[PDB]
Design a protein around this ligand. Structure first.
Ligand code: OWU
Ligand code: OWU
Ligand code: OWU
Ligand code: OWU
Lengths: 262, 258, 258, 262
């Protein structure tokens, strides 16, 4: 099929790329940078996200693969690159899909709505001052949050930032999204739930400003400033990321290898 | 149809049950506490958990209703009992299902327990050390006070006090949470809570002591010669008779926020 | 003696200050905002923190009073302002001291900052990595959102939201708390908060970026070319004029419990 | 001076003991099991606590030393035992003192008061049912606690159980005690502070029962059942444990070596 490869930038990753492109040529396989079907990422999880977001408009026609150079989303060590070209050329793989998080930001008098898709998470922090938003879950005013910010994570994203916030680890087969607090203030005048929340596939969380309307919104490795925000909407995306897998690397085992030693 | 009513025991709960039985007596509603299709609980969640475990062998045939006299599982206030009698006589309700936890203990038979809130494992009295196997993976050797495995609807209970997350009951999953784990240069646990899907099995296997203080909801018993505890989302569900809209996130708000 | 009054700025706070100045005008009380021995703050803790930093070069000569119009540092309600005028004119007060945090930033001079609540260190925008040296010990290489070093009286503020502990102000110590640290198979931080005594020095030294967003109480400024941040219990203290018994644990109760 | 040695029980620790006693004999030093002045512990931190509590009535006349066989309170590796006998016989050491926690339990119609001294901590848990106590700090009813129990730790005890509860690590030069919660219930009907508390040398925390009066009280490696408890009192002890130190092993470095790798 059509493929492309994104490099991290260092000398190692680049040469591995060329070498993989040289092997791919030997098998009558076409490099298509515009509309590929297999996207290969050589680098780290930062590099994998870069590739995911490079092709977020063709996620239904793409099956990602990662090669870890320096990798939660990687399944291949560099020394396995030649083997991966072969198995790939033979079509000896099975597609697997993880859930994604849709982020919608409504802002301005024009009520523009920017929609973002996130693989790890989307976070919301203020412009420097106090962060205060109302958390609306569907039709329920759940709480008025005051603190450093809010993190909304995918299942596969719970082992990243979410984890550092005290969130829980969810198996990627659970089409859910998780909301964790960042240094929430809690006394008698202000209260939050203080517990992470896990929302199912049909629920919508709507963050609404209370005073200042400027917010720093991150989507995975990105961080955008939005002014005059009226609403930040969170929901499990209908779109899913597809991985081309050739062997068994269960999620918990991947959790075990990343955080548990001996 | 056939029903029963279980009471917390106090004077108020007892009279309310008597009054409702007298109201059902005006309809084709048969009191039968051996084979009830409707079980009404009058009391707190402790009462409701008791009623659930009193009929765990026929959950597939029963619809539970809770009347609160904190009532997380109760949908009804005591003043509206008479209204509940009529609405139930008229069959003006839908059936909602909540997922449950299957807890299996095998020795050296095999005792199986269903849970609505959670199941925790602590030590008889000494050091608590157990290996945590997930499916075919030896995930970690836990060293602490104990472990908690809760249902979605139990995440707002003991799981919440442990730092776990609250999961909407539409998710068929179970969450595992540590109790004061040890993390030094050697001993290492994940720390984070864990949320497993319906097709996963969490197996706790002893390392040193084989006696464990095992809990299922409000019940706690010393189990001896334990060779394994296995947790997994039960194929069985608990069914409530729902009369008006009362979403889960709303109950969570009312119980903790304001 | 010489005094001054600083106001939050709103209409009520401004008039109250005017009314008190008119009351002090009946006693040998000289208004002097260059060299005041008594500084009165009318507003919130944000006002009080501002007043403190407006006179940090003469803390050894000033006694602070706080009038609340959440007021953790305020001892006085607005209705009792007139009573405060008389009691202060009569010298009917004792002096209580709270410990402070010394924050030193050295580049490639050396800026020094006193703190009443805390000092936090975050990243300009990229990854935050800093080595944490305690005295002559390389304790850990922190990887996270940032770090918070608070005074005893600041432990009820930002330090509390981070999970730190509340320390009674009679303890001359400072507490360090992490902000969303990273703990995987490689990166490893202590996790627990740290409480250091008066004779210890906590030095944060960059690894990669040398630009840090540094905060002292309510002030936050981008510091560039930072070579080190050093934290240590300041030899200096903040002095309040205390008129009635109001213990620290009582203020904590009123602010968080009921 | 007069010394004694407590062994863990295994074959290694016992032989090291005898061998140290053989060396101590060579230096005209007297083993006194009743009223020693140096107490040496060979084993782990569990063994060290056993020795501390074996001699809690002569803490003003004793200087403890630990040898780690399998040790937060140890300063010596077994291969250093001969060296320790020599330096000890030469009096080449400096005494250092850590704070301790006094625990007083008032119980029964007779209002008996049992007083315990703890090196790590003292914890309070119920008889199996619900645990509900009022926390009185001096003359202030601070909170009514509902949960699994309460932990009160010494400075040197903050790196043990306290740590596992989310408490903070205090340098042993701070004569304070720290209170951490065990799975406190928090909703709208019940509230706790949720934060660890650090009390100074002059403050007294008084746990008072609300309903049931039976409690399981632990003091370091011990756990006693007290019936009809009226009050559990906590305060920094006037007594301090003395260590004979011969070299620099700073507390934070000891924290570093125990929990921080590489
Ligand atoms: N305080 C925080 N704690 C934990 N995670 C955080 C924090 N702040 C941000 N993040 C995550 O960073 C992602 C952005 N990042 C790419 C990645 C990634 C990634 N994803 C996963 C995953 N799914 N599971 C498990 N580990 C994963 N990691 C690993 O994380 C490290 C990168 N983070 S950093 O080097 O500390 C600074 C931020 N780095 C970037 O700019 C690029 C690497 O070792 C990587 O391998 C965001 O999306 C947040 O999630
Ligand atoms: N440290 C703990 N923290 C939090 N929960 C704990 C703790 N220890 C045990 N549990 C739970 O108790 C259940 C058993 N319990 C009946 C119930 C219930 C119940 N279930 C839910 C739910 N699903 N969501 C939201 N609130 C819920 N609650 C409420 O919880 C309180 C009961 N806890 S108690 O009175 O403080 C002492 C223990 N109580 C019993 O003997 C009887 C009541 O207000 C009740 O209304 C076990 O199953 C554990 O889970
Ligand atoms: N995520 C955070 N959570 C908790 N505290 C935080 C957080 N971020 C910053 N801070 C502290 O704010 C101080 C600066 N702040 C003035 C004050 C104060 C103050 N000091 C104490 C004290 N010692 N004990 C007990 N309560 C105290 N409070 C109360 O705190 C609230 C202010 N926080 S805010 O309005 O939500 C947003 C930030 N506010 C400002 O701009 C001005 C008020 O009700 C106040 O009354 C810094 O110094 C950080 O410490
Ligand atoms: N959930 C818990 N998490 C953390 N600590 C706990 C927990 N439960 C009890 N404790 C402590 O145990 C002491 C009793 N214990 C002797 C010791 C000790 C000791 N003291 C210190 C110290 N000051 N700093 C740093 N590490 C220290 N350790 C180390 O701790 C382990 C022992 N705990 S155990 O093997 O998990 C089960 C309980 N063991 C006993 O019966 C005997 C060893 O590796 C030891 O080296 C109590 O006093 C609690 O503090």
């Amino acid at each position: 099929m059509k493929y492309m490869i994104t490099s991290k930038g260092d000398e190692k990753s680049d040469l591995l790329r060329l070498n993989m492109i040289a092997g791919f040529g030997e098998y009558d396989m076409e490099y298509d940078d515009v509309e590929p079907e297999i996207v290969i990422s050589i680098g780290g999880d930062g590099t994998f996200l870069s590739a995911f977001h490079q092709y977020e408009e063709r996620l239904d026609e793409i099956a990602f693969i990662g090669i870890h150079t320096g990798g939660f989303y990687a399944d291949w060590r560099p020394a396995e690159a030649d083997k991966l070209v072969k198995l790939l050329a033979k079509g000896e793989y099975q597609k697997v899909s993880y859930p994604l998080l849709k982020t919608t930001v409504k802002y301005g008098i024009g009520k523009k709505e920017a929609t973002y898709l996130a693989l790890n998470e989307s976070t919301v922090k203020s412009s420097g001052g106090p962060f205060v938003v109302d958390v609306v879950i569907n039709d329920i005013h759940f709480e008025r949050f005051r603190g450093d910010g809010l993190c909304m994570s995918t299942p596969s994203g719970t082992t990243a930032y979410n984890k550092s916030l005290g969130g829980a680890l969810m198996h990627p087969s659970i089409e859910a999204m998780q909301l964790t607090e960042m240094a929430s203030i809690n006394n008698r005048v202000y209260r939050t739930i203080g517990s992470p929340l896990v929302f199912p596939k049909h629920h919508v969380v709507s963050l609404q400003p209370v005073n200042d309307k400027d917010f720093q919104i991150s989507v995975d490795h990105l961080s955008i400033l939005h002014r005059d925000v009226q609403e930040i909407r969170y929901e499990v995306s209908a779109k899913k990321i597809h991985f081309a897998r050739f062997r068994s690397f269960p999620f918990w085992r991947r959790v075990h290898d990343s955080f548990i030693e001996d």
